[PDB]
Amino acid sequence: ACYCRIPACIAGERRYGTCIYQGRLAAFCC
After folding, report:
1. Selection from 28, 4, 7, 1 nearest residue 16 by Cα
2. In whole angstroms, what is the distance from residue 9 CA to residue 7 CA?
3. Which helix (H) or strand (E) segment is 4 a member of?
4. Cα(16)–Cα(8) distance, rounded to whole angstroms?
5. Are 14 and 30 spatial neighbours (Cβ–Cβ below 8 Å)?
6. Whole-number Cα distances in Å, 16 to 22, 23
7. Which structural domain range is residue 26 located in?
8. Cβ pair 4, 19 in contact under 8 A
9. How many whole angstroms separate alpha carbon 10 and alpha carbon 27?
């Protein structure tokens, strides 16, 4: 699965983009 994360992706994931969710910017991580 992919995840919209704050503050960053976690080890074993890569950042592939950005989410906009709940008025906040999140890393798109898979």
Report:
1. 28
2. 7
3. strand 3-5
4. 11
5. yes
6. 20, 20
7. 1-30
8. yes
9. 10
Burial class of residue 8 in the structure, from the number of CB atoms within 10 Å of its CB (0-12 exposed, 13-18 middle, 19+ buried) = exposed
Determine the length of the chain.
Answer: 30
7: its two tokens: 């503050």
| Resolved by | X-ray
Q: Of 24, 1, 22, whose CA–CA distance to 13 is shortest? A: 1
Residues followed by a break in the chain (C to N exceeding 2.5 Å) are none
| Overall number of domains in the chain | 1
- Contact partners, residue 12, CB within 8 Å, separation at least 6: none
